[model samples]
Target: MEQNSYVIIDETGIHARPATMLVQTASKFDSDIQLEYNGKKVNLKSIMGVMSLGVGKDAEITIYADGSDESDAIQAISDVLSKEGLTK
Candidate 1:
């Protein structure tokens, strides 16, 4: 498994657009990916699951990737997180 932690920087947090991008990106990989926050975890590919978390600015989140493409999956999601300016 591969994992990375990030502190959200966007004032809106993981809102619709970024959450959608993250889910879409995660869906492309075969590895099982999950997002963790506040002691809860959800499938990264699930839009509702992600939004349900209601992650706010400054929230610390972790992405976990497990399976054959774990490394690539983590890298891709990490890129999205940064590219979208969601995390610092």
Candidate 2:
């Protein structure tokens, strides 16, 4: 498994649009993707699962992936986070 953490910087947190972006990215990979925040972990491919976390500003979230495309998934998610200005 591969893992990395990012602190959300956007005041709006991981709201609808970014959550959609995140789910879209994760769904592209065969790897299993998970997001962990505040002791809760959820499937990254599920938009509702992501939104259910209610992640807010400055929250520290960790992404974990396990499978052949794990690295690529991480990079893709990281790129989206940067592109959306959601993580610092």
Candidate 3:
């Protein structure tokens, strides 16, 4: 298992666009992705779960992957988080 910690920077938090990007990126990998925040864990690959978290700016989240593609998936998602889901 691999875990990556990141801070959400968007003022609007993990809203539609970011959540969509997260789910899409997560789905590309064979590994299962899970994100933890506020004592809750959600499937990063699930748009519903991600959107439900209401992760806000400066909020910390831990992303985890456990499978053959763990390393690749972790790095990819980490990149997305750093990029603010590739949004402005």
Candidate 4:
């Protein structure tokens, strides 16, 4: 498993657009990915789960991946977050 924590920087946090992007990116990998926050966790590939988190700005979240392409998946996720300006 590979994992890392990131504090959301965008004022809107992981809103619709970013959550959609996250699901899209996560779906591309075979690895199982999950996001953890406030003692709760949800599938990274599930839009509903992501949206349900209601993550807001400054929230610290940890993303994890487990499977063959975990490293790649995690890297890609980080890249996506950066590209979206959600975290920096």
Q: Identify the leading candidate in terms of lDDT.
A: 1
What are the per-residue Cα lDDT tens digits for candidate 2 across 30-59? 788788777778888887878887778899
Candidate 3 segments exceeding 4 Å error: 85-88
> What overall lDDT goes with each candidate model?
0.83, 0.82, 0.76, 0.80
lDDT of 4 by residue, 21-88 (tens): 77677668878878777766888988788778777788877778898887888888888888898887
Model 3 C-alpha lDDT per residue in residues 1-88, reported as the tens digit of each score: 8867777767788876777776677768878878777777889888777878878777877778888887788888877776675322
Question: Where does model 1 exceed 4 Å of error?
Answer: none
Determine the backbone clash count of candidate 4: 0
Please report how far candidate 2 places residue 68 from its true position, in Å: 0.7
lDDT of 2 at 15: 78
**Which window of ten consecutive residues has the lowest lDDT sum in model 1?**
21-30
Question: Against the correct fold, how does model 4 do in TM-score?
Answer: 0.91
Alpha-carbon lDDT of model 1: 0.83
lDDT of candidate model 4 versus the reference:
0.80
Whole-model lDDT, model 3? 0.76
After TM-score superposition, the amount by which residue 21's alpha carbon in candidate 4 deviates from its true location, in angstroms, is 1.5
Alpha-carbon runs more than 4 Å astray in model 4 = none
* Full ranking by lDDT: 1, 2, 4, 3
What C-alpha lDDT, on a 0 to 100 scale, does residue 88 get in candidate 2? 86
Against the true structure, candidate 3 reaches a TM-score of 0.86
